[PDB]
Scaffold this active site. Structure first.
Site, PDB file in Angstrom:
ATOM      1  N   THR A  71       0.815  -1.208   0.000  1.00  0.00           N
ATOM      2  CA  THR A  71       0.000   0.000   0.000  1.00  0.00           C
ATOM      3  C   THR A  71       0.847   1.257   0.000  1.00  0.00           C
ATOM      4  OG1 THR A  71      -1.900  -1.087   1.020  1.00  0.00           O
ATOM      5  CG2 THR A  71      -1.674   1.299   1.439  1.00  0.00           C
TER       6      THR A  71
ATOM      7  N   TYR B  70      -7.741  -7.541   8.368  1.00  0.00           N
ATOM      8  CA  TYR B  70      -8.783  -6.986   7.484  1.00  0.00           C
ATOM      9  C   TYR B  70      -9.985  -7.953   7.370  1.00  0.00           C
ATOM     10  CZ  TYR B  70      -5.307  -3.399   6.480  1.00  0.00           C
ATOM     11  OH  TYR B  70      -4.359  -2.411   6.594  1.00  0.00           O
TER      12      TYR B  70
ATOM     13  N   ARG C 267       9.660  -3.781   1.608  1.00  0.00           N
ATOM     14  CA  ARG C 267      10.224  -2.474   1.941  1.00  0.00           C
ATOM     15  C   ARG C 267      11.427  -2.172   1.048  1.00  0.00           C
ATOM     16  NH1 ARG C 267      10.317  -3.191   8.339  1.00  0.00           N
ATOM     17  NH2 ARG C 267      10.212  -5.377   7.588  1.00  0.00           N
TER      18      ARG C 267
END
Ligand SMILES: Cc1cc2nc3c(=O)[nH]c(=O)nc-3n(C[C@H](O)[C@H](O)[C@H](O)COP(=O)(O)O)c2cc1C
Ligand SMILES: Cc1cc2nc3c(=O)[nH]c(=O)nc-3n(C[C@H](O)[C@H](O)[C@H](O)COP(=O)(O)O)c2cc1C
Ligand code: NA
Ligand code: NA
Ligand code: NA
Ligand code: NA
Ligand code: NA
Ligand code: NA
Ligand code: NA
Ligand code: NA
Lengths: 404, 404
Positions: A34, A192, A346
């Site tokens: 995201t 989620y 990352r």
């Protein structure tokens, strides 16, 4: 600081592997990440087109898109995340998947539904409530925030749960195919919606979708089964994070332990594989990381060996794989079985050519957490530019625009 | 041939450990080992008195008795195994537990119920059927054998399952206390009755005792709960063999995988521990062995790490621990957490002083599978005698007799 690494060229990371109908030429994957550089109406942007294109240049890489909303009710971020429910969304994504494909690479879209963590003010603007398996909140602060705007979380009705299968996710899958995605990945991780159904801290339903391990898994398996009939099992993945406590999942402190919940799910997936309906891959988050947070060895309560013992197909693992750089002992152990992919999130943000750097042992550029979630191109596509070329103030002003 | 071994004196195997209310002075345990030297009416014998006494001489050893029937319906061997349901049984066992106690050692009785594998002719002599969770057989040969004598396996009724809790196991527990046992161990391993309830290949019930993971576990947890109120949780153990395919358990080929079934059970046990009702120990069979058979590395489908991650109390592990003798690397790794006991069954049959031999690195005497299950003293207590003293023909003729 920069990470010194040994080259992975001659390792299993550069042996081909069939994943569903496609063959990858590297086992290094970009996991869903995201970044909030979509357009305001959730259509993918010009910035995203370059961003995914820049990461596709080692031919035969799998990229998995950032979490993408299945429908308006699935949304709930303040930042601009993309969707895949309209023709406009699909047409824009198709420009991006076309670009990845032209480099000989492949792309899976991660389908998200926020559920109880959806921002209640954002949902109120849509005339919707935050919804979940049960009417629960991740914290007291979340509860107070929702009640303050008169928009409490509520439990989906049984019919609404069916509508997720036959309407929301069906249409997202159809749009994903229109958009040229090679796979769709069900987001069942990180607290989620689908994780909220799976685990008991978030699901106290008394219909067929809660009240036992089997019932809590039912929605997820219904989605796997129904979507397999629409797009084929070879175009389906799923992501789980058994050990994560992100967004207040209780994990090993819940009343059913993740080894129980997730072994049940994975064994049901393997039974489908045994019958010729094997999904393309299971993506699992290693216990080194929980959501976007690193977890100390002291705090780690289990591992993902069970997935390897139970599932016989492709597994994607991710989570601080450079922790034992330069030699990558853990990565090498984990891919030794020849059916395992390894993801870097990352470091892929700051190294668009990460596959090439890992191949040839080139120092990794450090990532910049400060720009993970901002709204503009600085710290987004600027990692592809020579620093001398980058105009910082211009790039901070460069917000997402329509493709072309 | 004899096994060369390095001494374990200075290792964690000779550090004390509290198990329930008692403290052991060695972590080396004699696991339950069926030998068929009881009396015909299932009362323990003179031979058994010496056999357990001979294994109790390192002070503070835990011995676990051979599988012992809880009731007439629990029986079903042709050979003479012991029981613990009558005052006569308990009084004889008390002579044995007294002898172990006088050496400063401790003894747990393993409570067995055969279930679907009970010999149908033997059960017919009692006017009983073989019984189980469901009416199933371990093989076609077993089915034919039962139908041939007009004594088919049948499913216990719901009331009969309650009677197991409130009558059969309650009385066995009370008799075990009269007999001076320090613990009672529920046999939930190796395809016998409680394992038949736990796993789906053997349990297709449609009452509260089958039809889901939770329901299949219900009888076992009801026994843990009820027996804890009678004898105290500190006097309770349980044995499981998640990976075993003994007596045709499907294990990793079943419709629910052992990691799911047994993690559920172990996490429910830990929740009881969290509330102050923690049982004394969980005994688990390592995947190197299935029942009384060794399993190749190739055939091993999982391991017992999950038990260590989920349960915080004492764990007993057993199964070919001398496979990496002389250095015992695996044993040493497994006891490093300081709450783990290690069992030796086959080598304890031929080495009554096994704790002493392992302590001081004395070569292990090979065991004799040919006399594991015979009806007399040869290959039973003769391992305590100097070979020069043993009259073989006399000892083959020495069948079990009443204590004293
Ligand atoms: C900025 C950021 C965004 C992320 N977004 C997602 C996401 O959309 N979906 C998801 O499943 N995980 C997401 N994650 C978790 C990552 O995919 C990944 O599992 C995690 O960062 C550990 O991998 P790494 O150590 O290589 O970064 C995100 C992580 C970060 C740092
Ligand atoms: C002759 C024999 C009898 C056994 N009887 C029992 C029994 O009564 N109950 C049980 O749970 N396991 C029983 N077992 C399994 C053992 O307790 C043990 O787990 C297995 O032999 C592996 O340990 P080892 O390699 O040290 O022998 C028996 C094994 C053998 C060889
Ligand atoms: Na290749
Ligand atoms: Na939030
Ligand atoms: Na949060
Ligand atoms: Na692996
Ligand atoms: Na001591
Ligand atoms: Na038999
Ligand atoms: Na048999
Ligand atoms: Na251990």
């Amino acid at each position: 600081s920069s990470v010194k690494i040994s080259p992975l060229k001659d390792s299993e990371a550069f042996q081909s592997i069939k994943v569903g109908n496609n063959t990858l030429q590297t086992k290094i994957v970009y996991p869903p990440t995201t970044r909030f550089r979509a357009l305001e109406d959730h259509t993918p942007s010009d910035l995203q087109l370059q961003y995914y294109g820049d990461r596709s240049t080692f031919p035969g890489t799998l990229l998995i898109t950032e979490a993408t909303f299945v429908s308006p009710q699935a949304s709930g971020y303040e930042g601009a995340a993309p969707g895949i429910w309209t023709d406009k969304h699909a047409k824009a994504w198709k420009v991006i998947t076309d670009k990845v494909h032209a480099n000989g690479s492949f792309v899976s879209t991660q389908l998200i539904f926020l559920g109880r963590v959806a921002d209640p003010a954002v949902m109120k603007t849509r005339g919707l409530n935050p919804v979940s398996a049960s009417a629960t909140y991740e914290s007291d602060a979340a509860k107070e925030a929702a009640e303050a705007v008169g928009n409490p979380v509520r439990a989906l009705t049984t019919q609404e749960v069916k509508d997720l299968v036959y309407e929301a996710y069906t249409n997202a899958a159809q749009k994903a195919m229109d958009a040229g995605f090679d796979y769709i990945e069900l987001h069942a991780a990180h607290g989620y919606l689908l994780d909220q159904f799976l685990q008991p801290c978030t699901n106290q339903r008394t219909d067929e979708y809660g009240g036992s391990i089997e019932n809590r898994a039912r929605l997820i398996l219904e989605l796997i089964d129904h979507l397999s009939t629409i797009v084929g099992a070879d175009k389906i993945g799923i992501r789980i994070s058994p050990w994560a406590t992100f967004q207040n999942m209780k994990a090993h402190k819940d009343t059913v332990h993740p080894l129980t919940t997730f072994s049940y799910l994975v064994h049901e997936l393997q039974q489908r594989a045994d019958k010729g309906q094997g999904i393309a891959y299971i993506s699992v988050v290693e216990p080194r990381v929980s959501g976007n947070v690193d977890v100390s060895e002291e705090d780690q309560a289990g591992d993902n060996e069970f997935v390897s013992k139970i599932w016989k197909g492709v597994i994607l693992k991710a989570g601080n794989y450079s922790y034992d750089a330069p030699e990558f002992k853990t990565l090498k152990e984990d891919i030794a079985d020849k059916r395992t992919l390894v993801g870097f999130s990352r470091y892929f943000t700051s190294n668009p050519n990460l596959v090439w750097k890992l191949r040839d042992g080139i120092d990794l550029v450090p990532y910049d957490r400060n720009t993970f979630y901002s709204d503009n191109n600085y710290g987004y596509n600027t990692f592809s530019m020579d620093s001398e070329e980058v105009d910082k103030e211009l790039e901070i002003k460069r917000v997402p625009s329509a493709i072309e």
